[PDB]
């Protein structure tokens, strides 16, 4: 059948990144495997237009939540959304900095998960970090699910980049999933997914080239009285 | 001698809120006890002022981050505050809704820390479940702890209210933990404090009278090293 049964094997992605920082257009185009049980995986990344006009660093959480790694008694629900699909609103606000707006649209096809993304970053600081490279490296983080009524669920997240001038540059992350499909889904209580990502330069072209490690895994908290 | 050394028994604490709400001013008494290693404790809080002139469920943060339990391997910032003692200054931000903002200060007196905390609670909505008192449960969460340069930490959590509707109220936490002492302090790498929280009414005579539990402990998440 659907959802998580079409994860039940290795699978590739493609993610192809139309975007634009402060009226400066780029492309990134990614890709890479995650071998099943999910929950540990890498992905190759591109700036098809040459050199990527600010930090990557903001680029990690564009770069598959249907590849976190669930324990059984909480609902998988980007795994769920398939075979129809799933779409992401999502914005990140990064603090005395810019904003990143992005739609994300991810379809399966056999083993291959194939990712659309339009980014508008808006208002980022010519003298910041971001657009002067100088973040360094992204704090692990726990990332809070909560329902969001019949077709989706919320993800909120505090997203921290350390910086070369040793203050934390903070991203305040707020991203909506929702099923593309028409049947009942399973829609989770609230709980957690812990995110911890590492990008390094690869050898780099007359473009940038990216390599992203990230392991994802979900848990819960229990309630009162206990 | 100094720091975490001071925690290694049984304590009490007393609490003094200061509030308004949409000019409406309140007091709250509170005090309990925690006893040793601490990360599980109750509070009893009173209205002085009568009946509480919004829920009581915003208000569970302000009624003792040195009584969550940490383990061995990350440093205790709001314990390593003392004797010294700590500020804090706090605001949450309720979505659709009104904002708190609070100034607390920590202070020590043998094995009893007092607080004084002021807060203002502004442009809550009169039609709101908040002030309309429709607020039922508060969702544990992972709230963030960094530093935040020298003598300070910072604590950044979502701290979801189930409404009577079944919907949910999203309050964003944002709160500096700052050292009130003169000496060098260290500051611990970023990691998480799990906050569960449960209020209970008692019956209610002159003054709402309300108990309120919470665990609270901390864990770290390690970062990734190796290369690819
Ligand atoms: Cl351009
Ligand atoms: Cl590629
Ligand atoms: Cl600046
Ligand atoms: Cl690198
Ligand atoms: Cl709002
Ligand atoms: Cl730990
Ligand atoms: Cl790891
Ligand atoms: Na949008
Ligand atoms: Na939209």
């Not at 139309?18 to 185009?29: A, L, P, S, Y």
């Not at 249907?66 to 959304?81: L, T």
């Amino acid at each position: 059948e659907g959802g998580p049964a079409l994860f039940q094997s290795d699978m590739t992605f493609k993610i192809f990144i139309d975007g634009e920082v402060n009226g400066q257009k780029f492309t990134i185009v990614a890709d890479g495997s995650s071998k099943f049980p999910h929950g540990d995986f890498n992905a190759h990344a591109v700036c098809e237009t040459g050199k990527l006009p600010m930090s990557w660093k903001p680029i990690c959480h564009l770069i598959e939540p249907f590849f976190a790694r669930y324990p059984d008694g909480i609902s998988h629900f980007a795994q769920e959304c398939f075979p129809e699909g799933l779409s992401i609103d999502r914005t990140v606000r990064f603090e005395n900095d810019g904003t990143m707006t992005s739609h994300h649209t991810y379809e399966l096809d056999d083993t291959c998960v194939v990712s659309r993304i339009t980014v508008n970053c808006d208002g980022f600081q010519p003298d910041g970090p971001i657009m002067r490279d100088q973040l360094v490296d992204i704090l692990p983080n726990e990332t809070h699910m909560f329902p969001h009524g019949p077709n989706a669920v919320r993800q909120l997240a505090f997203i921290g980049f350390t910086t070369a001038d040793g203050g934390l540059m903070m991203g305040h992350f707020d991203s909506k999933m929702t099923f593309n499909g028409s049947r009942a889904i399973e829609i989770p209580g609230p709980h957690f997914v812990t995110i911890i990502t590492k990008q390094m330069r690869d050898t780099s072209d007359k473009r940038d080239h990216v390599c992203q490690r990230e392991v994802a895994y979900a848990h819960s908290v229990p309630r009162i009285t206990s």
